[PDB]
């Protein structure tokens, strides 16, 4: 089917799901293929869960958690119809948000469903996580985004965002901005701390099908078979707003910084490869990495994520993270 | 240098910006009308940028006993076994025989 990308947080492995049953987990630099599943129910999305050693895929109805080789570990019963997956990785919480319109946080380390929240506004159309904060922004068919937390039945804050449903949201690494895109051909840059919209683009030529904020504040938007990238749109100055054209050599408009139209495809999702400067687009007939010469950050840290991480370093390190997992209950705003 | 010269091609005056395909010829963001000679020179360079210039056109032209001769006649002839000569002597190890 049309595909769906997920680069492992570390940077190395990649996971592609189809839409028919074809899931595969690979290494992409050494080319070596970790696992491959030809399950025939329509998969929607996938994530890695903590290592390359575990992944979790949506399916037709349930959630299935597989090994590093695709031997099925678990059949998550209580996550019924999860069109969206995410993993918030200091707290170890697998998060699904449905088509039911229920939001479930599940601790994959002890095996015990932490919270089961009711988002009442209908089937969840988009979902992203504040990484600096670990709080789930779910975007809902009213046109309103809503910030949740596991230890609160009520949404922490509701944010009236678009007119008509919310196609896709994506949050900065610094935890301070949120770009959201909406089916009324719209795109809005919100300043999450202080909760004011910075600045908003109100007529795109066709709906913003996806967005993603890179590891350097750079913005990628995808509108059908087009991928557009604006640099420095996540500033407060009014002189930043993403225009598509410079009205005759005007150095205040922000014309795009890169662009690529695929011809016959229709881009499904997109992510940035973490520590190299590429972004991976997943579309109807495969995967592509576009080389984007500003994109990722150069110089990572090694006490959090090496991309050169050996086997012993992996297994020592993961028991250290398990031993220090933050409680589910911390997560404030 | 060439061997002909075109009086109207120099005296003509052509627009550019009227067509997407050729807006990219300009050097300024001011010029809109160029004369024929500069239009033709821009256009030649774009042809170069479409189909890059090789060695065979440019670097090489055709201009006692020689040295090149074995290679030259090999280039000329295409089927090098002598057959056409009424050989008078029946060649060995491969017979040519037809059943009646």
């Amino acid at each position: 089917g049309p595909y769906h990308i997920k680069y492992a947080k570390n940077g190395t492995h990649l996971l592609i799901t189809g839409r028919k049953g074809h899931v595969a987990s690979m290494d992409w630099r050494k080319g070596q293929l970790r696992a491959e599943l030809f399950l025939n129910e329509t998969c929607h999305s996938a994530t890695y869960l903590q290592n390359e050693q575990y992944f979790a895929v949506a399916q037709k109805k349930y959630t299935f958690i597989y090994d590093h080789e695709g031997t099925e570990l678990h059949r998550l019963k209580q996550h019924i119809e999860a069109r969206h997956l995410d993993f918030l990785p200091y707290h170890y919480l697998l998060v699904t948000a449905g088509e039911t319109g229920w939001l479930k946080y599940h601790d994959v380390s002890t095996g015990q469903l932490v919270s089961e929240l009711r988002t009442k506004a209908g089937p969840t159309m988009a979902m992203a996580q504040n990484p600096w904060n670990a709080v789930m922004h779910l975007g809902h068919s009213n046109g309103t985004v809503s910030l949740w937390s596991p230890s609160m039945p009520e949404p922490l804050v509701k944010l009236l965002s678009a007119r008509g449903p919310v196609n896709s949201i994506a949050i900065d690494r610094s935890g301070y901005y949120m770009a959201t895109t909406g089916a009324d051909r719209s795109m809005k840059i919100w300043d999450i701390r202080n909760f004011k919209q910075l600045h908003s683009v109100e007529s795109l030529p066709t709906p913003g099908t996806n967005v993603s904020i890179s590891d350097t504040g750079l913005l990628a938007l995808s509108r059908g078979p087009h991928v557009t990238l604006w640099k420095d749109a996540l500033k407060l100055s009014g002189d930043s707003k993403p225009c598509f054209g410079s009205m005759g050599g005007n150095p205040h408009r922000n014309t795009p910084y890169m662009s690529h139209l695929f011809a016959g495809n229709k881009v499904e999702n997109l992510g940035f490869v973490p520590f190299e400067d590429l972004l991976g687009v997943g579309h109807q007939t495969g995967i592509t990495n576009l080389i984007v010469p500003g994109a990722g950050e150069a110089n990572y840290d090694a006490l959090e994520l090496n991309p050169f991480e050996t086997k012993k370093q992996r297994q020592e390190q993961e028991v250290r993270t398990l031993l220090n997992k933050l409680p589910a209950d911390t997560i404030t705003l | 240098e060439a061997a002909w010269i075109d009086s109207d091609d120099e005296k003509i005056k052509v627009p550019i910006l009227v067509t997407n395909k050729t807006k990219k010829l300009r050097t300024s963001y001011n010029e809109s009308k160029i004369n024929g000679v500069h239009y033709i020179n821009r256009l030649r360079s774009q042809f170069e940028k479409i189909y890059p210039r090789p060695k065979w056109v440019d670097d090489e032209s055709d201009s006692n006993g020689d040295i090149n001769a074995l290679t030259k006649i090999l280039s000329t002839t295409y089927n090098y076994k002598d057959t056409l000569s009424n050989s008078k002597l029946l060649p060995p190890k491969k017979l040519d025989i037809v059943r009646l």
């Binding site: 630099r29 080319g31 | 290679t71 006649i73 090999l74 050989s87 008078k88 002597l89």
Partner: protein
């Protein structure tokens, strides 16, 4: 095509990048001299010290190598990497690697070459990146433990599958393996390009020129049946034969001579092609050894062609060329040789050319006919040429002398050709 196969070709692309500490010990422990564990314990600075010492030794033996000390063996070459460099830069690094492998292909029975090229192996991964030039350089040592080593490290390209079977073994590759390598065709194209480059940069020697000779010979022998294979292998060997002649080393010229001889006795080539063979051969002939070999070769080629036009004159230019290169006393002592190669067809072609282009050395003609035992139709052709010469010229004493020589031998043929023309 499958995800598995596209991933496989990805790994082949990124085949030399150390992405892990495990992979880096795999790559770094492949090495020409040491065993695995020792090689993987030591580091680039040590290998460079050993290599610089060895290249100073090789510069002593052969003085071309100081340029490589300027440009591939510096402290900067400790620092450089091969994968972090744009494609223009990689192309230049492969030019320098190819020129190094030429200019020390000839020393591969020497521990200094072992040490210096071991630095090239480890810092620049020639055993992954340019293996075809590695193998075509060091090919002819195919018994020396050095080639067994080089096979043991290398990963074999698509045109060397015969050795792909023989890799990692205590027995060496064998002669019939080398012949079957060459008996495939696209390898003959490849090897020809390597020899053109080798000639043009002037690094040839008897050992490898013998080896390439023996393989081109053996390819023609195995293809001696399939006339389509032979006819399609004509242009490649005859291109090499021409270029290898146009060189100036007597060893090159002897190799080209033996290639021409074997190929023309295995396939009947056209008259114009044997003529141009002679043209190139003579026109760059100088040395003494080549002079003797070239004489034997031209006699053998003309003996091969047979049909009509069998025994005609050389054209003017080729005849004059042959006279410049070869004295009549030289061809006379060649006919005075003991072994006496069969050379009748060339001798009578030469004789008809003399009597139609020089009209003076008829005493020499009688000398030649005294020396060699021609055949009946050669007699008929020569005698008719002399008849026409008599009817165009003054009846000269030497022309008479030739006539009474034939009167001494075969009055009756003189009568028969006379009945053809005269009384």
């Amino acid at each position: 095509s499958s995800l598995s196969d596209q991933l496989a070709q990805v790994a082949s692309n990124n085949a030399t990048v150390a992405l892990d500490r495990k992979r880096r010990q795999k790559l770094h422990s492949a090495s020409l001299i040491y065993n695995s564990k020792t090689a993987a314990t030591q580091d680039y600075d040590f290998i460079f010290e050993n290599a610089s010492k060895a290249l100073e030794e090789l510069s002593q033996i052969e003085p071309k190598f100081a340029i490589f000390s300027r440009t591939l063996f510096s402290e900067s070459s400790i620092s450089l990497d091969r994968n972090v460099q744009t494609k223009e830069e990689i192309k230049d690094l492969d030019n320098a690697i190819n020129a190094y492998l030429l200019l020390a292909s000839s020393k591969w029975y020497l521990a200094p070459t072992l040490h210096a090229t071991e630095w090239l192996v480890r810092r620049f991964q020639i055993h992954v990146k340019n293996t075809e030039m590695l193998l075509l350089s060091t090919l002819n040592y195919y018994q020396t433990p050095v080639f067994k080593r080089i096979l043991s490290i290398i990963k074999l390209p698509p045109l060397f599958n015969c050795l792909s079977n023989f890799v990692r073994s205590e027995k060496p590759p064998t002669a019939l393996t080398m012949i079957k390598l060459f008996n495939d065709m696209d390898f003959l194209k490849l090897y020809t390009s390597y020899l053109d480059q080798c000639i043009k940069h002037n690094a040839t020697y008897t050992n490898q020129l013998l080896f390439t000779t023996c393989c081109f010979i053996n390819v023609v022998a195995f293809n001696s049946n399939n006339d389509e294979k032979l006819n399609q292998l004509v242009p490649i060997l005859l291109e090499i034969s021409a270029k290898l002649l146009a060189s100036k080393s007597k060893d090159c010229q002897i190799a080209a001579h033996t290639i021409l001889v074997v190929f023309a006795t295995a396939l009947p080539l056209k008259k114009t092609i044997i003529l141009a063979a002679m043209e190139t051969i003579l026109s760059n002939l100088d040395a003494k050894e080549a002079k003797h070999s070239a004489l034997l070769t031209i006699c053998k080629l003309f003996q091969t062609l047979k049909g009509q036009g069998n025994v005609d004159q050389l054209p003017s230019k080729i005849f004059k060329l042959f006279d410049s290169k070869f004295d009549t006393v030289s061809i006379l002592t060649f006919l005075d040789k003991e072994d006496k190669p069969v050379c009748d067809k060339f001798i009578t072609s030469y004789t008809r050319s003399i009597a139609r282009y020089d009209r003076s050395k008829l005493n020499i003609i009688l000398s030649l006919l005294k020396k060699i035992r021609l055949e009946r139709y050669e007699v008929r052709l020569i005698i008719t040429d002399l008849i026409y010469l008599s009817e165009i010229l003054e009846d000269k004493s030497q022309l008479v002398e030739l006539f009474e020589y034939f009167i001494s031998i075969n009055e009756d043929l003189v009568l028969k050709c006379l009945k053809s023309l005269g009384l």
